[PDB]
């Protein structure tokens, strides 16, 4: 396909030429063609072996959770909300133009729910989604009980050293470590069958009801409503609560009037957001906005009218780099015991990390690459009656101690915080630290903050956060954990990682691995499990310079942390990621080695490079465990890339010739209204970020079979941007040129941006040259003008006599392209634009010539060129050269004839 | 080749059986209930573990327990013999040497392809070997298995490949015809002798070497074991000896080695030491990778079926032809004359 | 001439060849093809009882000339066939015509000039089948092909009463019993000759020593030549106070009373050399794909067995004898084992009479006469090593070309292997061209001399493997060969290889064979197994004590001070006061040596570390060699000197520097190494290998960890057992087997804290089957396992024999 597909709206894809012109009749309502109703919209699409694969989801979708029976998750058939999301394969049926016709249609059904699963789900509770307008102080939650309150009680740390052996806390120096955060105030937590609110607290430390469902709706909901009334063109004070309803609609939250639908519905609707296609599979994953708890592996062989089943992430073991890193995450999921009763969580029923904030998903060769953020999941005491941690989440910093032997392996396998709290505040000598200084009677023991006495009678259930933080507790360690600010005091100051907060996750998934997942999802009766063994994790905090005024040298906490966040988020503590995309390096590799491929993904403050070994389709590793897993590299944004609003991401393309990724941001995606219900007016324009590879890549020469330095990427705000125009599309014609299609008012306009030493700038003359197509598919040709086709002046026919070409046959002249380059002088419109003449025999004594000229996309066009099989009819000239004679084979017969005649 | 022998007291026959449960104690290697032989055992290894990996007791290799094994008793004098693994491969089953590039080469060896990737240019932290195993049970449980290999070759997509045909196998030199052939002359058969041994001590069992006794009449007590010397009788008790093996009836075709990259066979985190003994840190490095062996360069060869017989291949620098078929019009060169 | 579609391509089992890629000036393929037809009833060629194999084999070749067709067609670069080349049937065969400078006359469109007459021996080459093809590296349009009799393909399809196994199946009418074939009865002290034993040292020289003990002294061994024409004056290594059992006649290796229909070769080495139709052949030939005269022959050479067998080392004339001689010969014959280093009782494939000479008699030396001074002189041999039909075609296949020469490294042996018979490649042939390809020459040599330069620096794998040798080529390496090819700039060999015999380096006490039946059967050729087997309770104190010394404690009532059973706990303590009585006095001389009154002991690794043919840092060093393997028991690949393989002379010359000692006075003061003599050249061939490899690049127990990591092909499960209380245990490695304890109580009780483990606690896993006083007392054990000889009380510590 010599074309570009452009999503004109939620239903229509139009095909564009390299001349930024639509192919006529190509524009197609893919929803209508999928035989889907007018409630469906395109979520994502992809080309695989020349066919178009589309993910559609419905605004009418209604899901339910009934904790009893056991077909617990189902669609709501009553009314009209039985509207599952579909993937559809389209093929182009015509060889002239574009007639999309439907091939295969796959329904994305709701997860099976095992018994073991439904016991966790019964009491599963989920945080209200983070938005644009969520503040550091909105997130912040009331600090829970200390380790030594949980255990010993109201009472003393004069007995902390007498007692900590009788609660498996031997040598624990942290009686004042936090056991977590209160669910009586803050961001709303809700079961699968409940609805999140449109109101977010400004200070969640004071203003939320947390998981207090019943309390919200009889007390605090009327307060929120009177303080923060929806617009009605009202206006109020927004002293205690933002109103984010429109910001909510924006990120794909659905609504019956002013009330969001249930959590399970928003989970399903988000879950069907991104797609990728291999020879054998379609995989479907969720967006960067809500946590997703399941993904689809559809077998492309699937019979026509089947119901493809999603695999739970709680049933999907990843390799987090080392077993310890898994344990860290699983230990904090909840309390495990043979001794307790009805106390069910993901950990107690032997599930793993249940939820990801997925960056996106792609295919290279027959491999699915994904990445994303570990969505915080912890236990919470849902007990009723004198339970000390009642209504409290059970969470703790897991950040590596100061004394930790340095080098990555050691850092991420440090025993610090493994089974319970250890971190808080420490004033050794006069050198403050939040992290334990060391990790002597024997070695330091950590324990899960559920006191031995209540171990039988306690009720620890699972929750999921809206973000990558486990721990919302309004203490100083929380800020430092979230911002990447904990450092050792050795002769290098390597930064001390968490393994529960701000954890990024990526991998490459083989077709056998997708085969288990399909097996997990079809499993009769009990939960079948999947190992994905080509994965890694990484501590990836938000940058500390996206905040102000942090104290060191009244410690600053979440409720008081100051955001200066340039990237379209109020908050400066919760990381985000978007637009994972893979691509094959075009740069040759040494023969008998296979082509290189990577991926990239945007996170707050930087681009991440994932690196692969094409040999066995593995993550790049190196021998040393000191250097850190070489599959990952982080390159920080400058001011210009930091300024882009990441919540406006529209689409990411990769071009195999340039070896370059294009990230398109469209500001029309911003919500209509603020959290204070103020019309949003910077909703005009768009921006392009160009990502390239940097470093020494695998398999250049004998030296680069081995690598001990991770290849990385570089994001550059390219110069292609606007605060005025409405975007239709950006066509990356070449490294040297991009075409932008936009409306100023309401008609489409074509700008050409030219790369000048790494910075794109508009070229107004080339824009006018390209846009002057006169209704044709391609720019006009004018003989007397340097236009998009440069300028061609033919030699006069008197050139043949002067240079003695007339005595040659037309056939020699026609098979001598250097002679016939001497028939014209060419003036390029852009540097190194090229042109040749194609010759055609016209008679035994004459020929015609016509130019073959490169356009902006590096391709040659001539009289016979097509796009999508449609002749372009550009209008190149034909020039005639004439007078040629036969070669001298006659000389001997002729001079004999003359002699005989004379005789 | 999979043909290390195992030491046996007990067969699957009536009242001769040995059990997976209530008769072996993996947690108590200090006493006779751990069943360590102490005489006649293959050097360097451990017999009861090898019997478990072969699945001669328990449902590990078959849909029901075969009950074949070894036991140490304190009540009486006892008898034993070595027997084969159930496999008929041998160390002469070596095929074509093939060269992949300027430094990497490999060959077929029975059910494996082996590669000596680093021999010309060694490196620290690399093990120097890659291996790909065949999967087809109809080949692996055959009676003269190497006769099914049709050759191995380099291919122009950049991999070594090999051909197989499950229809190529043949019977032994006789079908037993009229009598009970206990010594069936076959490529894994040997005239293993009786070992006769004194009663084990009930406690402190291994404080001294185990004592053998006159074996010159011992054969009369162990006739089930003498029948189990022939590999076909082992296969019959393991459920592999007839059509109960199932799978493809025909299914000849092409086999290919696992994919490879410059990282393949890097084990630098399992090599060297700074806390312990090198085998133990390599054991930790292997334990998380038991389900992911391909990055170590260890795995199974991929396979595709073909129609009809496979007889051989002929090779060119551009293409490989099977039975002499597979040639093409050379379409990129048609316009030159 | 033109293509016939009725012939189809095939792979030979012995080399796995099927096609050659042509390279350089005109690319394409040559490949083997054969007729498709079924129902090949070879058993219709009836064999009578009254005649030899040769007329039968010629009748089978004459039958196969009617029943089948074979050819070597050319294909183009995309696999289109060009011309047929059925060598039995092609029209007007000719050699190529030459100019006066030896060059073939040629013009590409015309092709070669043909003389109009076939090469030499055409009347017997026309029945042979081609089986491997190669191209010249330096000469244009010049190729080489190897040919064999069709029985070298059809060997397993010939009838079963002539192509027999080396062992009989029997009728089993009395029911089966594997003990009935084994010669088993142990030797005994001679009832009329007890007194000829070694003399006790009546007085022992001081050597400035000081300590003393009550124990009996060392035993003298003396040898000297005297003046007599056929006898020594002393020869104490040749004493014989033990003799074999009588059990309805004497127990010994005596082939004619065991082999009633003895297994023998299809043809002998002296038949295959002279019957020119049955020997293998190489020819040079010329080819061009689009000429009028597209193909014609160069020259013909016989791969003559005598050009290999006359290049065997001098000791291969006497494979029943070795450089240790009389005492080792007697100790092996007393244990009913193979004497020498290569006899047919284990290795019948290399002997013209097969099993019919499976005996220790007449070893090329005078032995078994009435006087120990009369034994021990060189004489005529009873059976040299040969190259009979079965071993011969295992030494055929795997070609390569280098300069003006071409080679044959031998096959994997699947031409001629049977279920109890193991023929292998034993070396390499070379064919060389001279006078600008106007003339040719042929030769071959065994791997035993070509591998003589192997040393521990030449491998990145494990060290000290049983691949070493000395001035006598009694170590005999042989291979199943995977091939020889160019790896970039480097010439490389691959396959599987025989080590020295690791299963019989530990050796039995003389009487106990009736309770060790597998360990003797593994030496008898009855059990053809090369794996090492745990048997320590019956071994003697050292493998190398002479037979005149053994009979010093027939009761066991002194625990045999000079010679006893190998238990590791009851070794004599040298302490430091002890040495003066047991070793620190007994000085040797140019005619006197001693056997010590010391209880030596140790397990399987200490046995191999002392008496295996281990590699070392310098060549020709290994003074000890045991015996040679039944089958290949190692992986092997190597880098070769392609230049030296081209530069070495056709004929190897050995000399008196490779002969065994002519009489035992020259054996007592035997020279370990010598310089090459002025006429000899054998020392040039030692260095054809640059480097070799044998497995993973791993050291110590780490290698047992790799052995546990790989999956068993019968079920896809790794021997490590860890990927799923009361869980099973691994087989090769010791990690997580038994329990951990600190080694601080072992042996010297020193260095363990800092020079063993990188850590403060010296932890090792104690493994399966271990001894402790309690689960708390988990480190070491004291000398509490004292042991009785019979019922005659324990080992008696603080007694005057142990003080």
From Swiss-Prot, chain A:
Pfam families the UniProt entry points to: MGP3_C (PF19342), MgpC (PF05220)
Keywords: Cell adhesion, Cell membrane, Membrane, Signal, Transmembrane, Transmembrane helix
Region (Disordered): 138-183, 200-234
GO cellular component terms listed in the entry, alphabetical order: plasma membrane
Biased composition (Basic and acidic residues): 140-151
Membrane topology of the entry: Single-pass membrane protein
Protein localization: Cell membrane
Ranges of compositional bias, category Polar residues: 155-183
Matches recorded under CDD domains: adhesin_P110-like
Knockout mutant characteristics: Probably essential, it was not disrupted in a global transposon mutagenesis study.
InterPro entries membership: MGP3_C, MgpC
A GO biological process held by the record: cell adhesion
Main localization, broad class: membrane
Entry protein name: Mgp-operon protein 3
From Swiss-Prot, chain B:
Assigned keywords, A-Z: Cell membrane, Cytadherence, Membrane, Signal, Transmembrane, Transmembrane helix
Composition-biased stretches (Basic and acidic residues): 18-31
Claim: Ligase is one of the keywords in the record: no
Primary location class: membrane
Annotated GO biological process: adhesion of symbiont to microvasculature
Transmembrane helix in keyword set: yes
Localization in the cell: Cell membrane
Region (Disordered): 12-34
GO CC entries: plasma membrane
Assigned protein family: Belongs to the adhesin P1 family.
Purpose of the protein: The protein is the major adhesin mediating the attachment of this mycoplasma to the ciliated epithelium.
Protein name from the UniProt record: Adhesin P1
Residues of the whole record sequence present: 916 to 1252 of 1444
């Amino acid at each position: 396909a010599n074309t570009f597909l452009v999503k004109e709206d939620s239903k229509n894809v139009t095909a564009y030429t390299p001349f930024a012109t639509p192919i006529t009749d190509s524009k197609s309502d893919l929803v209508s063609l999928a035989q889907l109703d007018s409630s469906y919209q395109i979520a994502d699409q992809t080309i695989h072996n020349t066919n178009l694969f589309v993910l559609f989801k419905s605004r009418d979708v209604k899901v339910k959770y009934e904790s009893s029976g056991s077909n617990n998750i189902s669609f709501d058939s009553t009314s009209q909300g039985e509207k599952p999301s579909y993937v559809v394969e389209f093929t182009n049926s015509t060889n002239i133009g574009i007639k999309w016709t439907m091939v295969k249609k796959y329904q994305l059904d709701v997860p099976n729910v095992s018994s073991d699963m439904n016991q966790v789900l019964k009491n599963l509770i989920l945080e209200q989604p983070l938005t644009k307008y969520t503040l550091n102080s909105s997130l912040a939650k009331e600090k829970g009980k200390t380790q030594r309150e949980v255990h010993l009680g109201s009472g003393q740390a004069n007995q902390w050293t007498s007692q900590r052996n009788q609660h498996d806390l031997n040598n624990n120096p942290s009686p004042n470590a936090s056991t977590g955060f209160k669910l009586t105030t803050g961001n709303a937590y809700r079961k699968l069958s409940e609805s999140w609110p449109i109101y977010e607290p400004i200070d969640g430390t004071k203003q939320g009801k947390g998981k207090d469902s019943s309390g919200w709706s009889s007390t605090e909901e009327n307060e929120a409503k009177n303080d923060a009334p929806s617009v009605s063109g009202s206006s109020g004070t927004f002293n205690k609560y933002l109103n984010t309803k429109q910001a909510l609609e924006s990120i794909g939250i659905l609504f019956d009037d002013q009330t969001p639908r249930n959590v399970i519905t928003q989970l399903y609707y988000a879950s069907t957001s991104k797609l990728a296609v291999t020879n054998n599979h379609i995989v479907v994953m969720g967006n960067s906005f809500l946590p997703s708890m399941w993904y689809w592996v559809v077998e492309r062989s699937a019979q026509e009218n089947a119901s493809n089943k999603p695999t739970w992430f709680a049933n999907t073991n990843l390799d987090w780099g080392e077993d310890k890193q898994k344990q860290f995450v699983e230990n904090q999921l909840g309390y495990k015991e043979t001794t307790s009763t009805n106390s069910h969580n993901f950990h107690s029923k032997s599930f793993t990390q249940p939820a990801y904030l997925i960056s996106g998903i792609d295919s290279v060769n027959d491999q699915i690459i994904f990445s994303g953020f570990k969505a915080g999941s912890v236990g919470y005491d849902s007990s009723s009656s004198s339970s000390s941690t009642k209504d409290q989440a059970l969470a703790w910093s897991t950040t590596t101690s100061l004394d930790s032997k340095t080098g990555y392996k050691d850092l991420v396998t440090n025993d610090t915080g493994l089974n319970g709290p250890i971190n808080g505040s420490f004033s050794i000598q006069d050198t403050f630290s939040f992290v334990v200084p060391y990790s002597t009677t024997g070695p330091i023991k950590t324990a899960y903050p559920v006191k031995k006495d209540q171990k039988s009678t306690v009720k620890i259930n699972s929750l999921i956060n809206a973000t990558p933080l486990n721990s919302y507790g309004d203490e100083g360690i929380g800020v430092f954990d979230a911002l990447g600010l904990n450092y050792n005091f050795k002769s290098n100051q390597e930064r001390l990682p968490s393994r529960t907060d701000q954890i990024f996750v990526y991998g490459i998934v083989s077709p056998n691995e997708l085969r288990s997942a399909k097996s997990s999802a079809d499993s009769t009766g009990s939960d079948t499990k999947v190992n994905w063994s080509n994965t890694q994790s990484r501590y990836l905090p938000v940058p500390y310079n996206y905040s102000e005024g942090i104290i060191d040298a009244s410690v600053t906490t979440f409720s008081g942390l100051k955001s200066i966040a340039p990237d379209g988020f109020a908050n400066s503590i919760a990381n985000f990621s978007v637009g994972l995309k893979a691509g094959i390096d075009p740069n040759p590799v040494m023969s008998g080695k296979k082509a290189n491929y990577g991926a990239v993904v945007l996170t707050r403050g930087g681009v991440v490079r994932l690196n692969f070994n094409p040999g066995n389709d593995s993550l790049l590793s190196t021998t040393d465990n000191n250097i850190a897993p070489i599959s990952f590299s982080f390159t920080p944004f400058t001011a210009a890339e930091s300024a882009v609003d990441l919540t406006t991401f529209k689409e990411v393309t990769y071009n195999q010739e340039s070896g370059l990724w294009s990230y398109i941001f469209d500001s029309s995606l911003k919500p209509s209204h603020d959290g204070k219900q103020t019309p949003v007016t910077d909703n005009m324009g768009f921006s392009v970020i160009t990502v390239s590879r940097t470093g020494i890549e695998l398999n250049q020469d004998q030296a680069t079979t081995t690598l001990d330095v991770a290849p990385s990427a570089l994001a550059v705000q390219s110069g292609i941007q606007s605060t005025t125009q409405t975007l239709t599309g950006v066509l990356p014609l070449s490294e040297e040129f991009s075409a932008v299609i936009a409306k100023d008012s309401d008609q489409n306009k074509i700008d050409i941006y030219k790369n000048n030493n790494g910075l794109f700038e508009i070229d107004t003359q080339l824009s006018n040259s390209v846009a002057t197509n006169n209704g044709g598919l391609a720019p006009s040709y004018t003989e007397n003008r340097v236009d998009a086709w440069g300028k061609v002046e033919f030699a006069d026919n008197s050139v043949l006599q002067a240079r003695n070409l007339v005595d040659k046959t037309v056939d020699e002249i026609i098979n001598t392209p250097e002679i016939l380059n001497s028939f014209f002088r060419f003036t390029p419109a852009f540097e190194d634009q090229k042109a040749t003449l194609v010759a055609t025999k016209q008679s035994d004594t004459s020929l015609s010539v016509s130019p073959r000229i490169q356009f902006l996309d590096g391709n040659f066009y001539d009289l016979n060129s097509t796009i999508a099989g449609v002749p372009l009819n550009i209008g190149f000239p034909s020039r005639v050269f004439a007078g040629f004679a036969a070669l001298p084979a006659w000389v001997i017969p002729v001079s004999v004839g003359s002699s005989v005649g004379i005789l | 080749l999979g043909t290390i022998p195992v030491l046996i007291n007990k067969s699957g026959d009536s009242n001769d059986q040995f059990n997976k449960d209530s008769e072996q104690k993996w947690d108590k290697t200090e006493t006779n209930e751990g069943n360590l032989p102490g005489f006649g055992e293959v050097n360097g290894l451990y017999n009861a573990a090898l019997l478990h990996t072969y699945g001669f007791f328990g449902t590990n290799t078959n849909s029901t327990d075969p009950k074949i094994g070894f036991k140490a008793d304190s009540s009486s004098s006892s008898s034993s013999t070595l027997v084969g693994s159930g496999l008929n491969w041998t160390s002469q089953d070596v095929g074509n040497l093939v060269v992949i590039n300027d430094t990497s080469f490999g060959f077929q060896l029975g059910g494996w392809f082996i590669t000596f990737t680093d021999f010309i240019r060694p490196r620290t932290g690399y093990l120097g070997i890659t291996l790909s195993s065949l999967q087809d049970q109809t080949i692996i449980w055959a009676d003269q298995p190497w006769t099914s290999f049709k050759g191995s070759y380099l291919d122009s997509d950049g991999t070594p490949k090999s051909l197989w045909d499950p229809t190529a196998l043949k019977s032994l030199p006789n079908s037993s015809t009229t009598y009970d052939t206990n010594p069936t002359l076959s490529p894994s058969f040997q005239l293993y002798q009786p070992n006769k041994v004194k009663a084990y001590q009930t406690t402190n069992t291994y404080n001294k070497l185990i004592e053998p006794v006159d074996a010159t009449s011992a054969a009369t007590n162990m006739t089930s074991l003498l029948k189990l010397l022939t590999t076909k009788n082992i296969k019959a008790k393991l459920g592999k000896g007839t059509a109960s093996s199932q799978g493809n009836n025909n299914g000849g075709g092409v086999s290919q080695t696992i994919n490879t990259i410059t990282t393949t066979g890097n084990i630098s985190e399992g090599l060297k030491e700074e806390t312990s003994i090198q085998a133990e840190t390599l054991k930790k490095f292997f334990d998380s990778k038991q389900n992911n062996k391909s990055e170590i360069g260890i795995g199974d060869s991929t396979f595709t079926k073909m129609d009809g017989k496979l007889t051989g291949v002929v090779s060119t620098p551009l293409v490989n032809l099977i039975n002499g078929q597979g040639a093409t019009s050379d379409s990129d060169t048609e316009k030159i004359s | 001439q033109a293509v016939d579609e009725t012939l189809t391509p095939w792979t030979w089992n012995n080399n796995n060849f099927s096609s050659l890629k042509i390279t350089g000036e005109n690319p394409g393929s040559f490949g083997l093809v054969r007729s498709q037809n079924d129902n090949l009833n070879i058993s219709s060629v009836t064999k009578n009882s009254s005649d030899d194999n040769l007329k039968y084999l010629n009748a089978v070749e004459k039958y196969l000339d009617g029943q089948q067709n074979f050819a070597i067609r050319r294909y183009d670069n995309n696999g289109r066939a060009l011309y047929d080349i059925n060598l039995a049937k092609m029209e007007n065969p000719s050699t190529v015509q030459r100019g006066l400078n030896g060059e073939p006359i040629f013009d590409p469109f015309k092709g070669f000039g043909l003389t109009g007459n076939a090469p030499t021996d055409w009347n017997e080459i026309k029945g042979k089948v081609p089986v491997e093809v190669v191209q010249s590296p330096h000469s244009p349009n010049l190729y080489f092909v190897l040919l064999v009799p069709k029985v070298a393909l059809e060997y397993h399809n010939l009838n079963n009463q002539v192509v027999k196994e080396s062992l009989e199946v029997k009728a089993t009418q009395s029911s089966f019993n594997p003990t009935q074939r084994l010669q088993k009865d142990s030797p005994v002290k001679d009832s009329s000759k007890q007194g000829e034993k070694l003399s006790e040292t009546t007085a022992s020289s001081m050597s400035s020593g000081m300590a003393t003990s009550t124990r009996a002294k060392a035993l003298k061994v003396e040898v000297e030549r005297g003046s007599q024409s056929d006898s020594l004056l002393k020869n104490d290594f040749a004493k014989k106070p033990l003799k074999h059992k009588n059990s309805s006649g004497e127990v010994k290796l005596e082939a004619e009373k065991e082999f009633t229909e003895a297994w023998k070769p299809l043809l002998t080495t002296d038949q295959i050399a002279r019957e020119k139709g049955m020997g293998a052949t190489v020819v040079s030939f010329y080819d061009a794909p689009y000429s009028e005269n597209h193909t014609a022959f160069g020259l013909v050479d016989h791969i003559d067995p005598k050009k290999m067998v006359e290049n065997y080392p001098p000791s291969w004339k006497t494979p029943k004898w070795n450089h240790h001689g009389i005492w080792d010969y007697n100790a092996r014959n007393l244990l009913l084992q193979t004497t020498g280093f290569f006899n047919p009782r284990r290795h019948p494939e290399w002997f013209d009479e097969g099993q019919a000479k499976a005996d220790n008699t007449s070893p090329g030396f005078k032995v078994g006469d009435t006087d120990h001074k009369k034994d021990g002189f060189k004489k005529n041999s009873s059976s040299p090593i040969a190259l009979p039909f079965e071993a011969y075609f295992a030494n055929i296949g795997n070609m390569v070309a280098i300069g003006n020469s071409v080679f044959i490294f031998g096959g994997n042996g699947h031409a001629t292997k049977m279920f109890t018979t193991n023929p292998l490649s034993i070396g390499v042939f070379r064919i060389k061209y001279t006078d600008n390809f106007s003339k040719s020459s042929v030769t071959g040599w065994p791997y035993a001399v070509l591998f003589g330069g192997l040393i521990n620096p030449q491998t990145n794998g494990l060290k000290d493997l049983p691949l070493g040798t000395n001035r006598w080529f009694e170590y005999v390496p042989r291979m199943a060969v995977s091939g020889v090819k160019w790896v970039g700039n480097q010439l490389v060999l691959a396959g599987t290889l025989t080590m020295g015999d690791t299963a019989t380096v530990p050796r039995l006490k003389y009487d106990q064979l009736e309770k060790h039946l597998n360990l003797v059967a593994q030496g008898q050729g009855l059990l053809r197994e090369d794996l090492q087997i745990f048997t320590p309770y019956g071994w003697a104190n050292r493998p190398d004590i002479p037979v005149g010394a053994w009979l010093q404690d027939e009761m066991g009532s002194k625990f045999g001070p000079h010679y006893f059973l190998n238990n590791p706990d009851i070794q004599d303590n040298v302490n430091n006061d002890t040495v003066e009585a047991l070793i620190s006095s007994y000085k040797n001389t140019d005619k006197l040596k001693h056997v010590y009154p010391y209880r030596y002991s140790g397990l399987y690794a200490w046995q191999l570390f002392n008496w295996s043919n281990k590699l070392t840092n310098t060549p020709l060093s290994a003074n000890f060699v045991n015996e040679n393997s039944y089958a290949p028991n190692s992986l092997f690949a190597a880098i070769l000197n392609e230049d030296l393989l081209t530069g070495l002379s056709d004929k190897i010359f050995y000399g008196k520097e490779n002969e065994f000692a002519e009489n035992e006075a020259d054996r007592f003061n035997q020279l370990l190494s010598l310089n090459p003599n002025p006429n000899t050249n054998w020392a040039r061939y030692l260095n054809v290998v640059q480097r070799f490899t044998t497995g993973p690049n791993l050291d110590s127990s780490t290698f047992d960890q790799f052995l546990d990591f790989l999956p068993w092909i019968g079920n896809g499960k790794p021997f490590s057992n860890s990927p799923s209380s009361s869980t099973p245990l691994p087989t090769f490695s010791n990690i997580n087997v038994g329990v951990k304890s600190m080694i601080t109580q072992h042996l010297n009780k020193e260095n363990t804290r800092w020079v063993f483990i990188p850590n403060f606690s010296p932890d090792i896993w104690t493994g399966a089957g271990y001894r402790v006083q309690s689960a708390n007392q988990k480190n070491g054990i004291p000398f509490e396992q004292v042991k009785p000889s019979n019922n005659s009380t324990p080992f008696d510590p603080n007694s005057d024999d142990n003080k």
